[PDB]
Structures are given as structure tokens and as C-alpha cells.
Design a binder for this molecule. Structure first.
Ligand SMILES: Nc1nc2c(c(=O)[nH]1)N[C@H]1C(S)=C(S)[C@@H](COP(=O)(O)OP(=O)(O)OC[C@H]3O[C@@H](n4cnc5c(=O)[nH]c(N)nc54)[C@H](O)[C@@H]3O)O[C@H]1N2
Ligand code: SF4
Ligand code: SF4
Ligand code: SF4
Ligand code: SF4
Ligand code: SF4
Ligand code: SF4
Ligand code: SF4
Ligand code: SF4
Ligand code: SF4
Ligand code: SF4
Lengths: 148, 296, 79, 131, 386
């Protein structure tokens, strides 16, 4: 599973997808893209979202509430979510969360969507908390989309 | 990036400068480089000047040709009348020896010789050719769809006729210019007698304005009946006729159409994202604002 | 044996049309590779189709579905 | 009207800067608003026309276009660069990262006004505009 | 020249309509591009060699617009209609004047496929599995829709034939609305209140068409007035389930998965298909995307602590569901991952020399190919296996 939270590899890092994340056929991923689930979260419908298989079009600035929703789902009593969170609908939240739980080895990438909005570092550290929580039942690894 | 000398006759630079500006910008966006012609003048306008004196028509067109000959480049044009003058005098003087001789001993008084080494192209012809930018390349360059607009094409007469003297094929119902408008995303419509003259050629525009305007009004009636929202054209003469003549028709007759008239280069600029201010659409007699509301 | 056309004007060199083509993936990713010819290679930042004579494509649509900013048009009709 | 706004990247923008920060390519690539079609209609902005983007920490005249990357109703976007940073507010929230994405702004359709080049913008903000 | 043999080929929406005009007689070979599956059983069979196969994967995925799965040279086609009879999923139709009309069948000059569908309505139970698993939209469960997903077809309690009796104590009917303030069967009518009596008095009316053995309203009665009972009369089978026969493709999915073995389908083709998994270049699930009968799968990667040194296969097939169509072979961009060979077509109608030729054409083994010849660019050419 690959999550591009608040990032846009197609225009920021062009050959990121074709070199490291999605399209290369690895060793344990010989089937290539076709067994990778790509989730892209950002308010725009970016080119990364075009290539993706999911898209969680979130209100700009509400990523903290989104992360908190995900983490309540993961911690188990996700029924206490409101009807919708950050513009994202609870059933879609549960869908993506189930995929994340069942991931054999996940990876989250983040960028300006998290480091340049309200709660600059608290967005990132709630993301890191989410990763540390997911490593309870799966293997998940945050990773920052460094620029230069 | 192919390079051509840009002839730029009288009406585009001095009445519709947005046409030439969009020509340069859009041609550069596709793989074409339009170089200024150094001291070019009026192509001796084929009607108003050929009707007076064919020998001075030949001499002035040959001078315009030898400017680009010294530049060592191929002429590119955006006017059907300028195409007639430049291309046809080039073709005639490439084959008629006594006319070469006469023009050369006229030009020798200004230290200048014609040898016939270059070729003349219309910009729409280049946009249509496949070696140079093709229809697919135009479609690629288009960034604003211009969808949901009915657009009527006026071919003009001096580009395609007579077919025994040109190489563009059928003159009865050509569709090549309709493909360039379809590339932009606008749907080209067909109207009655689409190959009719606009009426401005041959100096009739000046000699008998009512006669010329009646010929134009026949076209405008057919185009409105079809349901066009603009008229694309490949000639600044025809654009001037369809633009001024709508106002003169509104005053001399009682007919109102308010149909914007745009050069194909202006539509190509609109498709590629140029601004209406950067195209100087405020310099047309007929307001383009309804068409802009539709396509924007 | 179809024909693919790449709009050079909006190609970014992303190389996800090269990596995703299943005819390109034949050489290094197959047991006993059959054919080692390649449709695309990104030369000077844009995807160039070496398959000039339209002999290797199979109209799969993996490359059209891969390019992030649609720029590859697949022609299913004889060239 | 309040019209929340973000500032982000584009390949044409990266291409442009590596051609050169003072180049026509950079001008064309960065002087751009990419807003929603519904918002453009509601405000009254003609496609491909200059517009006045005026936040609490500045102002800039920028071309107004529509972007493929579909901004939902109520969002704006400038490709990052000279023009965007003419209007970005400097608030950092004690983190050193200015509010580069998510600041309110008002948009006023103002055609017939030119765009300011990169050199003119910066050298005139500082007071060095010789030309 | 002469004009009136007007040959036209128009793409009217999703139907590619291929036509031959005369003054009063027309000929319309109509291909429904939403049902074509990219098999070539229309190109192998064409007596006049006009139908060619196009970008199967792209068209079947939606990424191609200016073409269909197949191209028919309507100048060469003879409008025999052999393609319409021999297409397993009926995505080709012949209309002579304005009506679907097959002269060769009208004269009995050609056998037809024996899909042999049937659903013994004395065994089917209105289950929903056969409609759910059927890859092609071709199983019709004619069944009133009960409370599941809709308003009751008859009622939850009339989906079964039961026997129930309800009785009350007029002696203890306080006539509070609780009995019908719960069930939709109980409707209490309070006839108008008049000081004559100075009391409340009405009636409790119970309808069979809505009850159940729920018995909640017995104790929802404040005063104990109510009683009830139940049991089934045999069998219910409300409606019928049967197979559309011009759409079914002999997959055996619904027969293999029917709960009561009430479906009788026989595959039209017989043979064997093999997948050399070690030659699939990974991320090319075109075969999976274009298989009509969804026989193909990507074998799911095992978890860790379960791989046991065997890594995974890249592609495989289910011979139980493969119908030997050929879309997989026509779509694969690989070299020889797939091997297809049909051995026997099952028909009704006697035979013909033409049909023996068509059998010989359909029964030659085939496999994919890379780098076919350029002179035929725009179509598919497979490998002839010895
Ligand atoms: N061509 C080009 N490439 C570059 C750069 C360049 O300037 N030009 N810059 C380089 C450098 S310096 C950088 S740091 C990297 C970084 O580049 P990235 O980290 O990948 O981020 P961006 O490209 O700016 O796009 C960020 C995405 O997050 C979305 N977003 C905005 N607000 C929010 C929000 O509140 N929530 C969520 N979930 N998403 C939001 C934005 O819409 C955008 O889609 O790129 C590098 N690559
Ligand atoms: S259609 Fe398939 S085989 Fe052809 S170039 Fe694209 S990915 Fe390669
Ligand atoms: S995937 Fe698209 S953008 Fe990337 S190199 Fe290929 S054609 Fe160009
Ligand atoms: S389903 Fe197969 S046989 Fe029928 S028309 Fe389509 S390609 Fe031909
Ligand atoms: S109708 Fe007969 S000749 Fe025409 S395409 Fe079908 S099989 Fe071929
Ligand atoms: S699967 Fe069998 S039992 Fe169930 S509805 Fe279909 S035919 Fe009837
Ligand atoms: S709830 Fe009981 S007491 Fe009331 S009307 Fe019904 S049966 Fe009579
Ligand atoms: S037994 Fe149940 S279903 Fe029947 S009338 Fe009473 S409450 Fe209603
Ligand atoms: S027999 Fe197979 S193909 Fe036919 S309807 Fe039943 S499940 Fe579908
Ligand atoms: S698995 Fe069988 S049904 Fe599916 S495409 Fe291959 S031959 Fe056709
Ligand atoms: S069998 Fe063909 S379609 Fe399937 S993965 Fe291999 S090459 Fe791709």
C-alpha cells in the first residue's frame, strides 16, 4: 500500500513513481503496480490522484481531524466517528482504514499539504503517531518528501 | 523549429495587430519560428493595384520576394490576398523568362535582383502540413477546449482559386480548414454557398460599397441561418469586410447580425490560452463578448 | 501492432510509460526473455517511441492508463 | 469571496525556473491563478484575464485561468514563485514555516492592467527598480 | 462511375453500424461494442475474411475511442450472417431491411451453438447466487422483491407459506392502541367517542398478510389479551429463475455454484488452455481485464510466515470457467504465455462443408506473438503452433 498524504509526486518529484514507489516490479512485488493500492489525499484532483486508485478529497486544513479519525478507527472503536470528517465520508474512511490494516507492508509520503498548513508540525506528528499505531498489526513507514 | 520570414502585409499590422501577435506566439508554441521581414511593404494588393498596372504589380511583389531571398528564408503569410500577390508572382517569375528579364531590369535601378530561390507558404497551410506542425500538433498545443461553439469558416478565394494554379485540391467543398477549427475543439458548421466570395476583392470594396456589401450580406444571411457564433477566416481583407461591413450594413440597410469575425490565428491564441486583451479583440467593430461568454 | 502517439509538448519525462509498458518489461522481468525490443525510452526529457513501424504494441492501455497527465493517445485503427 | 487559497508546484513551473528566473518561460509559468470554473463564473472573471489577488499581506495582479487539477468550489492556487510570495502572509506560528497554503484572499476582476515582471516586482518592493 | 452501392460505416453512439445502401434494400451488420469481448471467433469464422481484430485491451478498458474491438471491411462483407450465428456472446446482429433477419437460418443452411441452458423450476429456490456470480448480464430471477432492499413483494411473512391464528379477549381489550402501535397487521379503530356511553369502545382487526410469530404484541398488551401459532406448508418458490439463452456463454459459474444443482449449461467449446506463468511480465493484467468469463486471476500473494520459500505465481487460469473464447490470447502483449486449442464445438443443426471448414479454422492452436509484420499494422496476428 502507498499513501501520498498531501504530496504531488507527478509535479514535485517526476520519476518518483517510476523509480521507487508504484510502477517498478520489485522482488516481492513481481506483479508490479497491479498489486499496489495507491491512496492520494489532497483537496485538489492532482495528477497523482489521476494515477491513483483512491482519492480522499479533504478540506484544506483539516488533516488533523482526518488523522484523528483514522487513528480512532485503528484503535478500534471507530463507530464513534461523526457522519463525515474533514469532508471525507465515514464509509470511505473505513474502506481506506481496512486497506491500511490489511497492508502487508505500507508506506506513507507527505509534503507541503502537511508542512505548510495550520498546525505545521502537529499534522506531521499525528501522522507519525498513526504510523507507530499501524505498526501494531502491520508494517508501516512514514517518509518525508524532501525537496532539493 | 522551422524558421520562416513573416511577411505581415498592411491590414494585420495596422488594423488588427492582435492577429500578428497571436500569429507569432502560437506559431512559436507549435514548432514554427516567424522572423520579421526587413522593410517589406504592401504586397502590391492584387485587386486595387493589379487592376491598375500589372508590371508594377510584378515589380513590387518581386521586391518583396527578394528581401526574403537575401534573408535566405521561406516566406510565411497570413493573408489570402498577400498570398495571391507574393506566391503567384513568385510562381510566374520562376517560369516566364521575358517577365524575369523585365522585372530584373526594373529592379536593377535599385541594386536588387530576382533569382527565384525561395518558397511561399500560408500559415494555415503550414499548420495543416504534416512535415511542419500538423493537425495533431495543433490539438496537442490547444489548452482551452473552446467547446460548445458553432463556428463558420470562410476560405476566401485567393488562397484556393484557381485550382489549375494552386495545389490545395478541391475548391467546391474543401474540409481542411474545417479540420483546423475542429482541432481547436469548436464544431465547424456548414452553411449554404460556403465558397462564395465575401465581395471585397478586386477593389470592389472601394469602387462600389453597396454592391460589395450586398455580396457580403448574402453570406451573413446564410451564416446566421446555419447558426454560427463566430466566423473564422484566413484573410485580413475578408475580416475587414465581414467586420466593417456589418456596421455599414447596419447603417445602409437595416440588418443586424452581431457575429464576431476572428482570424484563425486569433482563435488559435484563444485556444492556447492567450487573453482577449492580449489579442486586442477590442479593436474589432463587432463585439466578441457573446462568443467569449460561450467559449469561456 | 497498433500505433501510439506521445504529445511531446506536455510530456514531463516521468518515465512511468517506460516502466509500465509490458513489452518493455519483457527483457528484465521474464524467465528466458523472448524479445528484447522496447517501445519507449525517455530521451531529452520526453518519451520517444522506438517502435517506428508499429510492430510490437498490443493495445494494452497500460501506458495510456499510466501517464499521470494524459499525453499518450492510443490508435486502435490501422495507421 | 473569502476564497481560501493555496500555493503549490507544477512541472512547467520547475522547467521555467531552470530555464531562468528572469525568462519569459518563468513569467508565463508562474503568473497564473488556477481557480474553479464555478468560482470564476460567480465572481465574474473572464477566462485568461488579469485579476487582482489581494490578501492582508500584499497584493498582486495575476492572470486568471482554469486548471486541470480540479480545485473544489472555494479554492485558489498560484504556482509558487515571485507572484505568490508577493501575497503570502508571513505568519509562522513559531515554527519558521510561513503560511504558504491556506490563507484567505479576495479576488477582483481587473483587466486592462498589465502584469508585473519578476524583476519589477522584487526590485520595486525593495526600492531598486532602475528600469 | 456508379453510386448506388453506397458503403457506409457509422459509429452511432456505442453501436458500430456497417451498411450497404441500395434504392430500397439495405444491409446492416450492427456490432454492439458494449458486449464484444475481443475474441476472434468472428474473424476466424468469416467466410469472406473481412472481420479483423483491433486494440482489444484498450477498447475493453475504455482507453480507446476511435475504434471498436473489431474492424469489418463492409466492402468485402457479404452479409451472410455466419459471424452473427458463430459469436458466443451475441454482440453482432444482421438487419436486412429494418428487422433482425437471418436468411441462412431461415433456409437452415448453417448449424447454431447448443448452449443448452435451462433452470428446473421445481428445484431452483429463488436464491440470488446465480445472478450474482454470472459474469454476463444473463440470468433472470423473476422474483417479487421482499423487504430486503425494497418494500415487500408480498410480505416478509408471505415469502413463506405459514399457518397463524390470532384471538383477543374483548373482555380485556382496554382499546389502547398498543396492539397496532407496533405491528402493521393490527389496526385498532376507535369508533367515535360519545358521552352516551362515556367510554372508549372500538375493535382490533388483524390481517394475515402482515403477521409473523413475533408475539411481541402479546406482552406489549398491558392487559393479557392475545394468542398465536405457526408452521410451513411444504415449499414456497415464489417466482421463477431461468437463463437468457442468447447472452449466456457456457461459463459454468452459476451451474458450479448453484445451491440446488438446478442449472444445466454445457460449454460450447472443448479443449485446453495453459498459462506459462514464468513468462508474464508482471504488471499487465490485460488478460484479467478482458476475460469474459473471469476465469483468470492474479494469484494472491501469500503473507509472511506463510511463503515457505515459494514466492508466487504471476498469472493463472481456472479451466472450470474458461470458455475457450480467445480474448486472453488476442489481448496478451507477451510472447507465448498463453496456449489456446479448441477440440470440439457443440452444435444443433446438422452440418455443412462450410461448417467443416469453419471447424478446421477454429481448431488450430494459437498463442501470442511480439513483433508481428508491419504491413498489417492496425490489427492482430497470432502465432501458428505446429
Ligand atoms: N517542478 C518543480 N518540482 C519541485 C519544486 C518546484 O518548485 N518546482 N519544489 C521542490 C521542493 S523545494 C519541494 S519541498 C518539493 C515538495 O513538493 P510536495 O511536497 O510534493 O508538495 P506540492 O508539490 O507543493 O503539492 C502539495 C500537495 O498538497 C496539497 N495541499 C494543499 N493543502 C493541503 C491540505 O491542507 N491537506 C492536504 N491533504 N493536501 C494539501 C496541495 O494541493 C498539493 O496537491 O518539490 C520539489 N519538486
Ligand atoms: S499499449 Fe501496451 S504494449 Fe502498446 S505501448 Fe502501451 S503499454 Fe506497450
Ligand atoms: S508517462 Fe506521459 S508524461 Fe511520462 S514520459 Fe510517458 S508520455 Fe511523458
Ligand atoms: S464477441 Fe467475439 S465473436 Fe462476437 S463480435 Fe465480438 S469479437 Fe466477434
Ligand atoms: S456477415 Fe459473413 S462475411 Fe460479413 S463479416 Fe460476418 S461472417 Fe464475414
Ligand atoms: S442459483 Fe440455482 S437455486 Fe439459486 S436462483 Fe439460480 S437457479 Fe435457482
Ligand atoms: S394492546 Fe391489548 S389491551 Fe390494548 S387494544 Fe390491543 S389487545 Fe386490547
Ligand atoms: S404477533 Fe408480531 S407480527 Fe403478529 S400482529 Fe403481533 S406484533 Fe404483529
Ligand atoms: S451459465 Fe454461466 S455464463 Fe451463462 S448465465 Fe449462468 S453463470 Fe452466466
Ligand atoms: S481464460 Fe478462457 S474465457 Fe477467459 S479469456 Fe482466456 S480463453 Fe477466454
Ligand atoms: S498473460 Fe498477457 S495480459 Fe496476462 S499478464 Fe501476461 S502479458 Fe499481461
Amino acid at each position: 500500500v502507498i499513501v501520498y498524504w498531501g504530496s504531488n509526486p507527478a509535479h514535485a518529484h517526476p520519476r518518483h513513481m517510476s523509480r521507487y514507489s508504484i510502477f517498478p516490479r520489485g522482488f516481492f512485488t513481481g506483479k508490479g503496480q497491479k498489486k499496489r493500492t495507491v491512496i492520494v489525499i489532497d483537496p485538489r484532483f492532482t495528477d497523482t490522484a489521476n494515477v491513483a486508485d483512491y482519492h480522499l478529497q479533504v478540506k484544506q486544513g483539516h488533516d488533523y481531524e482526518l488523522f484523528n479519525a483514522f487513528r480512532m478507527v485503528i484503535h478500534g472503536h471507530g463507530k464513534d466517528l461523526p457522519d463525515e470528517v474533514a469532508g471525507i465520508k465515514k464509509e470511505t474512511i473505513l474502506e481506506v482504514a481496512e486497506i491500511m490494516k490489511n497492508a502487508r507492508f505500507g508506506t506513507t509520503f507527505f509534503g507541503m499539504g502537511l508542512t505548510h498548513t495550520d498546525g505545521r508540525n502537529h499534522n506531521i506528528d499525528i501522522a507519525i503517531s498513526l504510523t507507530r499505531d499501524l505498526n501494531k498489526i502491520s508494517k508501516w513507514t512514514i517518509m518525508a518528501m524532501r525537496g532539493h | 523549429m522551422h524558421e520562416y520570414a513573416f511577411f505581415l502585409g498592411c491590414i494585420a499590422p495596422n488594423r488588427y495587430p492582435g492577429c500578428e501577435a497571436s500569429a507569432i506566439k502560437t506559431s512559436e508554441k507549435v514548432g514554427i519560428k516567424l522572423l520579421p521581414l526587413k522593410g517589406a511593404s504592401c504586397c502590391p494588393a492584387p485587386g486595387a493595384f493589379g487592376s491598375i498596372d500589372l508590371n508594377v504589380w510584378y515589380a513590387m511583389a518581386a521586391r518583396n520576394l527578394v528581401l526574403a531571398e537575401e534573408m535566405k528564408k521561406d516566406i510565411a503569410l497570413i493573408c489570402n490576398g498577400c498570398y495571391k500577390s507574393i506566391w503567384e508572382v513568385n510562381h510566374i517569375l520562376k517560369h516566364n523568362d521575358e517577365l524575369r528579364d523585365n522585372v530584373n531590369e526594373v529592379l536593377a535601378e535599385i541594386d536588387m535582383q530576382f533569382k527565384g530561390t525561395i518558397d511561399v507558404w500560408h500559415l494555415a497551410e503550414l499548420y495543416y502540413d504534416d512535415k511542419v506542425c500538423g493537425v495533431q500538433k495543433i490539438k496537442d498545443s490547444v489548452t482551452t477546449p473552446l467547446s460548445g461553439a458553432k463556428v463558420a469558416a470562410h476560405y476566401g478565394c485567393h488562397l484556393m482559386k484557381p485550382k489549375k494554379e494552386r495545389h490545395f485540391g478541391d475548391t467546391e467543398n474543401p474540409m481542411w480548414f474545417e479540420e483546423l477549427i475542429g482541432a481547436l475543439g469548436a464544431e465547424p458548421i456548414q452553411y449554404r454557398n460556403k465558397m462564395q466570395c465575401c465581395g471585397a476583392g478586386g477593389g470592389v470594396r472601394g469602387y462600389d460599397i453597396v454592391h460589395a456589401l450586398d455580396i457580403t450580406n448574402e453570406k451573413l444571411i446564410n451564416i446566421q441561418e446555419a447558426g454560427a457564433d463566430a466566423i473564422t477566416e484566413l484573410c485580413p481583407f475578408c475580416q475587414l469586410q465581414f467586420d466593417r461591413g456589418q456596421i455599414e450594413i447596419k447603417e445602409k440597410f437595416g440588418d443586424v447580425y452581431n457575429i464576431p469575425v476572428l482570424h484563425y490565428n486569433e482563435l488559435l491564441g484563444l485556444a492556447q490560452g492567450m487573453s482577449p486583451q492580449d489579442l486586442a479583440l477590442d479593436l474589432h467593430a463587432i463585439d466578441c463578448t457573446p462568443f467569449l461568454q460561450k467559449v469561456l | 501492432a497498433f500505433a501510439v502517439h506521445v504529445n511531446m509538448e506536455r510530456c514531463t519525462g516521468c518515465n512511468n510509460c517506460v516502466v509500465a509498458c509490458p513489452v518493455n518489461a519483457l527483457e528484465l522481468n521474464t524467465v528466458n526473455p523472448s524479445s528484447t525490443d522496447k517501445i519507449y525510452k525517455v530521451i531529452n526529457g520526453d518519451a520517444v517511441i522506438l517502435d517506428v513501424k508499429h510492430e510490437l504494441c498490443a493495445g494494452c492501455g497500460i501506458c495510456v492508463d499510466a501517464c499521470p497527465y494524459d499525453v499518450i493517445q492510443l490508435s486502435g485503427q490501422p495507421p | 469571496k473569502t476564497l481560501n487559497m493555496i500555493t503549490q508546484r507544477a512541472v512547467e513551473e520547475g522547467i521555467a525556473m531552470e530555464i531562468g528566473k528572469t525568462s519569459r518561460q518563468y513569467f508565463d509559468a508562474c503568473s497564473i491563478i488556477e481557480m474553479n470554473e464555478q468560482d470564476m463564473k460567480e465572481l465574474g472573471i473572464m477566462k485568461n484575464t488579469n485579476v487582482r489577488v489581494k490578501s492582508e499581506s500584499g497584493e498582486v495582479v495575476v492572470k486568471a485561468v482554469v486548471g486541470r487539477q480540479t480545485c473544489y468550489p472555494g479554492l485558489c492556487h498560484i504556482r509558487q514563485g515571485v507572484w505568490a510570495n508577493q501575497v503570502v502572509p508571513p505568519r509562522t506560528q513559531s515554527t519558521g514555516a510561513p503560511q504558504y497554503s491556506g490563507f484567505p484572499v479576495t479576488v477582483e476582476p481587473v483587466p486592462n492592467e498589465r502584469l508585473k515582471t519578476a524583476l519589477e516586482l522584487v526590485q520595486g518592493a525593495v526600492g531598486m527598480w532602475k528600469g | 462511375s456508379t453510386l448506388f452501392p453506397k458503403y457506409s460505416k457509422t459509429t452511432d453512439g456505442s453501436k458500430v453500424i456497417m451498411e450497404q445502401r441500395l434504392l430500397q434494400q439495405v444491409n446492416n451488420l450492427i456490432l454492439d461494442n458494449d458486449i464484444c469481448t475481443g475474441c476472434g471467433i468472428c474473424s476466424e469464422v468469416c467466410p469472406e475474411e473481412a472481420i479483423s481484430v483491433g486494440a482489444v485491451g484498450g477498447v475493453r478498458r475504455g482507453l480507446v475511442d476511435d475504434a471498436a474491438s473489431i474492424h469489418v471491411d463492409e466492402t468485402k462483407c457479404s452479409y451472410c450472417g455466419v459471424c452473427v450465428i458463430m459469436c458466443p456472446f451475441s454482440a453482432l446482429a444482421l438487419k436486412v431491411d429494418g428487422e433482425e433477419r437471418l436468411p441462412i437460418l431461415e433456409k437452415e443452411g448453417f448449424p447454431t451453438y447448443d448452449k443448452g441452458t435451462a433452470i428446473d423450476q421445481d428445484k431452483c429456490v429463488r436464491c440470488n447466487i446465480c445472478d450474482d456470480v454470472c459474469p454476463r448480464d444473463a440470468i433472470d430471477r423473476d422474483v417479487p422483491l421482499f423487504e430486503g432492499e425494497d418494500k415487500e413483494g408480498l410480505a416478509k411473512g408471505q415469502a413463506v407459506e405459514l399457518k397463524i391464528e390470532f384471538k383477543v379477549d374483548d373482555e380485556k381489550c382496554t382499546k389502547c392502541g398498543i396492539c397496532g402501535n407496533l405491528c402493521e397487521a393490527i389496526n385498532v379503530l376507535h369508533k367515535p367517542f360519545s358521552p352516551e356511553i362515556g367510554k372508549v369502545e372500538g375493535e382490533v382487526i388483524w390481517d394475515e398478510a402482515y403477521c409473523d410469530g413475533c408475539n411481541v404484541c402479546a406482552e406489549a398488551c398491558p392487559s393479557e389479551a392475545i394468542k398465536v401459532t405457526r408452521t410451513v406448508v411444504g415449499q414456497k418458490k415464489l417466482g421463477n429463475v431461468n437463463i437468457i439463452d442468447e447472452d449466456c456463454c457456457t461459463c459454468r459459474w452459476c451451474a458450479i455454484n448453484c445451491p440446488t444443482e438446478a442449472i444445466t449449461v454445457n460449454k460450447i467449446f472443448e479443449g485446453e488452455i495453459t498459462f506459462h506463468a514464468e513468462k508474464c511480465p508482471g504488471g499487465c493484467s490485460t488478460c484479467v481485464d478482458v476475460c469474459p468469463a473471469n476465469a483468470i486471476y492474479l494469484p494472491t500473494p501469500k503473507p509472511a510466515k506463510d511463503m515457505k520459500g515459494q514466492i508466487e505465481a504471476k498469472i493463472a487460469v481456472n479451466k472450470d470457467f474458461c470458455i475457450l473464447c480467445g480474448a486472453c490470447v488476442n489481448a496478451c502483449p507477451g510472447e507465448d504465455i498463453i496456449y489456446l486449442r479448441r477440440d470440439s464445438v457443440k452444435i444443433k443443426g446438422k452440418e455443412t462443408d462450410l461448417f467443416k471448414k469453419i471447424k478446421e479454422k477454429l481448431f488450430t492452436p494459437r498463442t501470442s506473438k511480439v513483433k508481428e509484420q508491419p504491413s498489417l499494422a492496425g490489427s492482430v496476428e497470432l502465432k501458428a503452433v505446429s
